Amino acid sequence: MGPGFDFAQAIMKKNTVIARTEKGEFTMLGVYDRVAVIPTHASVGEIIYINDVETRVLDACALRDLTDTNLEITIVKLDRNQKFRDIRHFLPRCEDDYNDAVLSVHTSKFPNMYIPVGQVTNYGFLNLGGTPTHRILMYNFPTRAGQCGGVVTTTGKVIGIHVGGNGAQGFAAMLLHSYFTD
Ligand SMILES: Cc1nnc2n1CCNC2
């Protein structure tokens, strides 16, 4: 409907896939080449389904800050026959707060969904389903089961991936440019 949705739509159409693990279906953001991100609670194994295609996982690391605290981001390298559009130039370099964000989701259950979540706080520390977690972004929208992995964007920036909520607020793990230097 406007410039926020236009940026979000561009990321969803070219840079997302449907990832299925033994823990369910997730929005998965492709970042560059065969490299994508997914919430660590997806529990990525040796084999993952990508748009219902059986895919070998070539390498996978969980992201953790230098305090040895969970960031809730898993980076995955897929044995896929096609590269993603490189979107690393849309990743912020530093922790920040934001105006006017959209949360975008694409699953079997929630196809082509775009939520205007408004203002995004650099919240920092969150106890996330019992796990101390750093670099959390917070927005005042009552997000639900099915939205994990959902991509959080502003006009010009891909800022995070949705990892939880409490029924009043939603929470996203920051994406930073330094996670994806090759
Ligand atoms: C690409 C990339 N960046 N960090 C990681 N990877 C794939 C292997 N695991 C960790």
PDB file of C-alpha atoms and ligand atoms in Angstrom:
ATOM      1  CA  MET A   1       0.000   0.000   0.000  1.00  0.00           C
ATOM      2  CA  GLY A   2       3.081   2.294   0.476  1.00  0.00           C
ATOM      3  CA  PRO A   3       6.918   2.448   0.400  1.00  0.00           C
ATOM      4  CA  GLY A   4       7.313   0.180   3.527  1.00  0.00           C
ATOM      5  CA  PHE A   5       5.232  -2.622   1.935  1.00  0.00           C
ATOM      6  CA  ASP A   6       7.045  -2.148  -1.420  1.00  0.00           C
ATOM      7  CA  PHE A   7      10.511  -2.788   0.126  1.00  0.00           C
ATOM      8  CA  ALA A   8       9.086  -5.705   2.221  1.00  0.00           C
ATOM      9  CA  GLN A   9       7.395  -7.265  -0.886  1.00  0.00           C
ATOM     10  CA  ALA A  10      10.727  -7.071  -2.867  1.00  0.00           C
ATOM     11  CA  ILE A  11      12.589  -8.963  -0.055  1.00  0.00           C
ATOM     12  CA  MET A  12       9.797 -11.580   0.343  1.00  0.00           C
ATOM     13  CA  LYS A  13       9.451 -12.379  -3.433  1.00  0.00           C
ATOM     14  CA  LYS A  14      13.209 -12.901  -4.168  1.00  0.00           C
ATOM     15  CA  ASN A  15      14.879 -13.570  -0.763  1.00  0.00           C
ATOM     16  CA  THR A  16      12.574 -15.909   1.237  1.00  0.00           C
ATOM     17  CA  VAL A  17      11.916 -19.658   1.158  1.00  0.00           C
ATOM     18  CA  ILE A  18       9.712 -21.956   3.267  1.00  0.00           C
ATOM     19  CA  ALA A  19      12.012 -24.020   5.603  1.00  0.00           C
ATOM     20  CA  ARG A  20      10.595 -27.167   7.318  1.00  0.00           C
ATOM     21  CA  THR A  21      12.449 -28.905  10.220  1.00  0.00           C
ATOM     22  CA  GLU A  22      11.125 -31.424  12.808  1.00  0.00           C
ATOM     23  CA  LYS A  23       9.991 -28.275  14.767  1.00  0.00           C
ATOM     24  CA  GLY A  24       7.624 -26.938  11.997  1.00  0.00           C
ATOM     25  CA  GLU A  25       7.544 -24.516   8.998  1.00  0.00           C
ATOM     26  CA  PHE A  26       9.503 -21.195   9.201  1.00  0.00           C
ATOM     27  CA  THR A  27      10.028 -18.111   6.985  1.00  0.00           C
ATOM     28  CA  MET A  28      13.763 -18.379   6.058  1.00  0.00           C
ATOM     29  CA  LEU A  29      15.619 -15.289   4.718  1.00  0.00           C
ATOM     30  CA  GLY A  30      18.223 -15.948   1.953  1.00  0.00           C
ATOM     31  CA  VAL A  31      21.068 -13.368   2.321  1.00  0.00           C
ATOM     32  CA  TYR A  32      23.643 -14.204  -0.453  1.00  0.00           C
ATOM     33  CA  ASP A  33      24.875 -17.248  -2.502  1.00  0.00           C
ATOM     34  CA  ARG A  34      23.488 -20.387  -0.681  1.00  0.00           C
ATOM     35  CA  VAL A  35      23.517 -18.701   2.775  1.00  0.00           C
ATOM     36  CA  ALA A  36      20.238 -18.103   4.733  1.00  0.00           C
ATOM     37  CA  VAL A  37      19.150 -17.423   8.371  1.00  0.00           C
ATOM     38  CA  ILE A  38      16.472 -19.036  10.586  1.00  0.00           C
ATOM     39  CA  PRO A  39      15.661 -18.788  14.344  1.00  0.00           C
ATOM     40  CA  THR A  40      17.947 -21.139  16.316  1.00  0.00           C
ATOM     41  CA  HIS A  41      14.812 -22.796  17.910  1.00  0.00           C
ATOM     42  CA  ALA A  42      14.059 -24.331  14.401  1.00  0.00           C
ATOM     43  CA  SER A  43      16.771 -26.960  15.350  1.00  0.00           C
ATOM     44  CA  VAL A  44      18.345 -27.320  11.861  1.00  0.00           C
ATOM     45  CA  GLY A  45      19.729 -30.866  11.260  1.00  0.00           C
ATOM     46  CA  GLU A  46      21.699 -32.509   8.391  1.00  0.00           C
ATOM     47  CA  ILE A  47      18.602 -32.464   6.082  1.00  0.00           C
ATOM     48  CA  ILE A  48      16.020 -29.647   5.791  1.00  0.00           C
ATOM     49  CA  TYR A  49      13.038 -29.145   3.462  1.00  0.00           C
ATOM     50  CA  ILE A  50      13.206 -25.940   1.379  1.00  0.00           C
ATOM     51  CA  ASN A  51       9.964 -25.210  -0.537  1.00  0.00           C
ATOM     52  CA  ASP A  52       9.141 -28.969   0.079  1.00  0.00           C
ATOM     53  CA  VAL A  53      12.460 -30.092  -1.592  1.00  0.00           C
ATOM     54  CA  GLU A  54      14.746 -32.386   0.458  1.00  0.00           C
ATOM     55  CA  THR A  55      17.965 -30.309   0.928  1.00  0.00           C
ATOM     56  CA  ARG A  56      21.337 -31.283   2.486  1.00  0.00           C
ATOM     57  CA  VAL A  57      22.647 -28.667   4.965  1.00  0.00           C
ATOM     58  CA  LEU A  58      26.350 -28.085   4.025  1.00  0.00           C
ATOM     59  CA  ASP A  59      27.312 -26.010   7.083  1.00  0.00           C
ATOM     60  CA  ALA A  60      25.408 -24.421   9.984  1.00  0.00           C
ATOM     61  CA  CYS A  61      26.559 -22.209  12.889  1.00  0.00           C
ATOM     62  CA  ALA A  62      24.496 -20.676  15.739  1.00  0.00           C
ATOM     63  CA  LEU A  63      25.257 -16.964  16.414  1.00  0.00           C
ATOM     64  CA  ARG A  64      26.314 -16.055  19.979  1.00  0.00           C
ATOM     65  CA  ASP A  65      27.694 -12.671  21.187  1.00  0.00           C
ATOM     66  CA  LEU A  66      31.180 -12.322  22.801  1.00  0.00           C
ATOM     67  CA  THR A  67      29.547 -12.508  26.334  1.00  0.00           C
ATOM     68  CA  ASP A  68      28.710 -16.125  25.208  1.00  0.00           C
ATOM     69  CA  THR A  69      24.962 -15.187  25.157  1.00  0.00           C
ATOM     70  CA  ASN A  70      22.382 -16.635  22.652  1.00  0.00           C
ATOM     71  CA  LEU A  71      21.482 -14.318  19.695  1.00  0.00           C
ATOM     72  CA  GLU A  72      18.768 -16.843  18.431  1.00  0.00           C
ATOM     73  CA  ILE A  73      20.095 -16.596  14.758  1.00  0.00           C
ATOM     74  CA  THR A  74      21.292 -19.755  12.952  1.00  0.00           C
ATOM     75  CA  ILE A  75      23.208 -19.201   9.687  1.00  0.00           C
ATOM     76  CA  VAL A  76      22.748 -22.137   7.241  1.00  0.00           C
ATOM     77  CA  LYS A  77      24.502 -22.994   3.987  1.00  0.00           C
ATOM     78  CA  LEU A  78      22.172 -25.032   1.723  1.00  0.00           C
ATOM     79  CA  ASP A  79      23.063 -27.594  -0.979  1.00  0.00           C
ATOM     80  CA  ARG A  80      20.790 -25.668  -3.415  1.00  0.00           C
ATOM     81  CA  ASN A  81      21.317 -25.356  -7.191  1.00  0.00           C
ATOM     82  CA  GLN A  82      20.551 -21.604  -7.202  1.00  0.00           C
ATOM     83  CA  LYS A  83      22.022 -18.495  -5.465  1.00  0.00           C
ATOM     84  CA  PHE A  84      19.987 -15.824  -3.614  1.00  0.00           C
ATOM     85  CA  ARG A  85      20.052 -12.191  -4.693  1.00  0.00           C
ATOM     86  CA  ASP A  86      22.807 -10.620  -2.514  1.00  0.00           C
ATOM     87  CA  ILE A  87      21.002  -8.321   0.035  1.00  0.00           C
ATOM     88  CA  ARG A  88      23.941  -7.774   2.453  1.00  0.00           C
ATOM     89  CA  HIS A  89      24.037  -4.033   1.498  1.00  0.00           C
ATOM     90  CA  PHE A  90      20.524  -3.682   3.098  1.00  0.00           C
ATOM     91  CA  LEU A  91      21.774  -4.939   6.535  1.00  0.00           C
ATOM     92  CA  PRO A  92      22.432  -2.327   9.263  1.00  0.00           C
ATOM     93  CA  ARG A  93      26.007  -2.111  10.590  1.00  0.00           C
ATOM     94  CA  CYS A  94      25.103  -1.190  14.228  1.00  0.00           C
ATOM     95  CA  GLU A  95      22.404  -1.841  16.890  1.00  0.00           C
ATOM     96  CA  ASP A  96      19.661   0.821  16.405  1.00  0.00           C
ATOM     97  CA  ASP A  97      15.976   1.696  16.980  1.00  0.00           C
ATOM     98  CA  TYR A  98      13.668   2.268  13.993  1.00  0.00           C
ATOM     99  CA  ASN A  99      10.465   3.982  12.886  1.00  0.00           C
ATOM    100  CA  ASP A 100       7.824   2.395  10.681  1.00  0.00           C
ATOM    101  CA  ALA A 101       8.767  -1.312  10.337  1.00  0.00           C
ATOM    102  CA  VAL A 102       6.881  -4.154   8.517  1.00  0.00           C
ATOM    103  CA  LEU A 103       6.952  -7.813   9.600  1.00  0.00           C
ATOM    104  CA  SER A 104       6.535 -10.110   6.544  1.00  0.00           C
ATOM    105  CA  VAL A 105       5.735 -13.877   6.680  1.00  0.00           C
ATOM    106  CA  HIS A 106       5.395 -16.539   3.974  1.00  0.00           C
ATOM    107  CA  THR A 107       4.306 -20.070   5.038  1.00  0.00           C
ATOM    108  CA  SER A 108       1.689 -22.697   3.937  1.00  0.00           C
ATOM    109  CA  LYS A 109      -0.469 -21.270   6.846  1.00  0.00           C
ATOM    110  CA  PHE A 110       0.262 -17.493   6.336  1.00  0.00           C
ATOM    111  CA  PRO A 111       1.000 -16.816   2.622  1.00  0.00           C
ATOM    112  CA  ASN A 112       1.850 -13.210   1.519  1.00  0.00           C
ATOM    113  CA  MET A 113       1.312 -11.684   5.023  1.00  0.00           C
ATOM    114  CA  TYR A 114       2.563  -8.100   5.791  1.00  0.00           C
ATOM    115  CA  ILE A 115       2.047  -6.521   9.275  1.00  0.00           C
ATOM    116  CA  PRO A 116       2.805  -2.817   9.928  1.00  0.00           C
ATOM    117  CA  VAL A 117       4.273  -3.095  13.474  1.00  0.00           C
ATOM    118  CA  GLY A 118       5.294   0.609  13.781  1.00  0.00           C
ATOM    119  CA  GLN A 119       8.126   1.758  16.097  1.00  0.00           C
ATOM    120  CA  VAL A 120      10.943  -0.754  16.909  1.00  0.00           C
ATOM    121  CA  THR A 121      12.866  -0.476  20.234  1.00  0.00           C
ATOM    122  CA  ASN A 122      16.441  -1.690  20.747  1.00  0.00           C
ATOM    123  CA  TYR A 123      15.281  -3.704  23.823  1.00  0.00           C
ATOM    124  CA  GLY A 124      18.583  -5.599  24.379  1.00  0.00           C
ATOM    125  CA  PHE A 125      18.298  -8.399  26.965  1.00  0.00           C
ATOM    126  CA  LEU A 126      15.251 -10.766  26.864  1.00  0.00           C
ATOM    127  CA  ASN A 127      14.601 -14.058  28.635  1.00  0.00           C
ATOM    128  CA  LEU A 128      13.237 -15.856  25.497  1.00  0.00           C
ATOM    129  CA  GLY A 129      11.365 -19.098  26.405  1.00  0.00           C
ATOM    130  CA  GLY A 130      13.802 -19.405  29.364  1.00  0.00           C
ATOM    131  CA  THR A 131      17.008 -18.596  27.339  1.00  0.00           C
ATOM    132  CA  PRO A 132      18.947 -15.346  28.052  1.00  0.00           C
ATOM    133  CA  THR A 133      19.120 -13.608  24.619  1.00  0.00           C
ATOM    134  CA  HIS A 134      20.862 -10.377  23.490  1.00  0.00           C
ATOM    135  CA  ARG A 135      20.301  -7.889  20.594  1.00  0.00           C
ATOM    136  CA  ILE A 136      16.457  -8.161  20.792  1.00  0.00           C
ATOM    137  CA  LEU A 137      14.214  -5.675  18.891  1.00  0.00           C
ATOM    138  CA  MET A 138      10.664  -5.107  20.293  1.00  0.00           C
ATOM    139  CA  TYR A 139       7.447  -3.881  18.599  1.00  0.00           C
ATOM    140  CA  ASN A 140       3.922  -3.439  20.007  1.00  0.00           C
ATOM    141  CA  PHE A 141       2.025  -5.956  17.815  1.00  0.00           C
ATOM    142  CA  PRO A 142       0.314  -9.136  19.169  1.00  0.00           C
ATOM    143  CA  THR A 143       2.266 -11.629  16.975  1.00  0.00           C
ATOM    144  CA  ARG A 144       1.317 -15.388  17.043  1.00  0.00           C
ATOM    145  CA  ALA A 145       2.589 -18.940  16.397  1.00  0.00           C
ATOM    146  CA  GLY A 146       3.409 -19.271  12.629  1.00  0.00           C
ATOM    147  CA  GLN A 147       5.256 -15.884  12.355  1.00  0.00           C
ATOM    148  CA  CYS A 148       8.732 -17.096  13.550  1.00  0.00           C
ATOM    149  CA  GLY A 149      11.449 -16.343  10.958  1.00  0.00           C
ATOM    150  CA  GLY A 150       9.257 -13.492   9.632  1.00  0.00           C
ATOM    151  CA  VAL A 151      11.392 -10.696   8.199  1.00  0.00           C
ATOM    152  CA  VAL A 152      11.443  -7.241   9.831  1.00  0.00           C
ATOM    153  CA  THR A 153      12.160  -4.387   7.379  1.00  0.00           C
ATOM    154  CA  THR A 154      12.099  -0.595   7.077  1.00  0.00           C
ATOM    155  CA  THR A 155      12.321   1.304   3.755  1.00  0.00           C
ATOM    156  CA  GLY A 156      15.923   0.528   2.725  1.00  0.00           C
ATOM    157  CA  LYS A 157      16.858  -1.901   5.578  1.00  0.00           C
ATOM    158  CA  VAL A 158      16.428  -5.576   6.591  1.00  0.00           C
ATOM    159  CA  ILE A 159      16.781  -5.229  10.406  1.00  0.00           C
ATOM    160  CA  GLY A 160      15.791  -8.575  12.035  1.00  0.00           C
ATOM    161  CA  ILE A 161      13.953 -11.925  12.055  1.00  0.00           C
ATOM    162  CA  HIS A 162      10.923 -12.555  14.299  1.00  0.00           C
ATOM    163  CA  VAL A 163      11.724 -15.009  17.157  1.00  0.00           C
ATOM    164  CA  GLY A 164       8.883 -14.651  19.764  1.00  0.00           C
ATOM    165  CA  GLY A 165       6.105 -12.699  21.491  1.00  0.00           C
ATOM    166  CA  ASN A 166       4.125 -12.453  24.753  1.00  0.00           C
ATOM    167  CA  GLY A 167       0.678 -11.734  23.171  1.00  0.00           C
ATOM    168  CA  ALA A 168       1.074  -7.898  23.420  1.00  0.00           C
ATOM    169  CA  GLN A 169       4.638  -7.460  21.991  1.00  0.00           C
ATOM    170  CA  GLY A 170       6.742  -9.235  19.309  1.00  0.00           C
ATOM    171  CA  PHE A 171      10.530  -9.772  19.472  1.00  0.00           C
ATOM    172  CA  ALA A 172      13.106 -10.007  16.658  1.00  0.00           C
ATOM    173  CA  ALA A 173      16.827 -10.978  16.638  1.00  0.00           C
ATOM    174  CA  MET A 174      18.895  -8.162  15.031  1.00  0.00           C
ATOM    175  CA  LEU A 175      20.574  -8.838  11.680  1.00  0.00           C
ATOM    176  CA  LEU A 176      23.972  -7.040  11.390  1.00  0.00           C
ATOM    177  CA  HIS A 177      26.217  -6.764   8.265  1.00  0.00           C
ATOM    178  CA  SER A 178      29.222  -8.216  10.260  1.00  0.00           C
ATOM    179  CA  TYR A 179      27.389 -11.590  10.648  1.00  0.00           C
ATOM    180  CA  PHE A 180      27.757 -12.255   6.877  1.00  0.00           C
ATOM    181  CA  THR A 181      31.270 -11.055   5.934  1.00  0.00           C
ATOM    182  CA  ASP A 182      32.680 -14.055   3.915  1.00  0.00           C
TER     183      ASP A 182
HETATM  184  C1  LIG B   1      28.232 -18.356   5.353  1.00  0.00           C
HETATM  185  C2  LIG B   1      28.423 -18.472   6.819  1.00  0.00           C
HETATM  186  N1  LIG B   1      28.649 -17.486   7.647  1.00  0.00           N
HETATM  187  N2  LIG B   1      28.760 -18.032   8.924  1.00  0.00           N
HETATM  188  C3  LIG B   1      28.601 -19.325   8.796  1.00  0.00           C
HETATM  189  N3  LIG B   1      28.377 -19.649   7.487  1.00  0.00           N
HETATM  190  C4  LIG B   1      28.123 -21.017   7.009  1.00  0.00           C
HETATM  191  C5  LIG B   1      28.823 -21.961   7.951  1.00  0.00           C
HETATM  192  N4  LIG B   1      28.389 -21.766   9.336  1.00  0.00           N
HETATM  193  C6  LIG B   1      28.670 -20.412   9.810  1.00  0.00           C
END
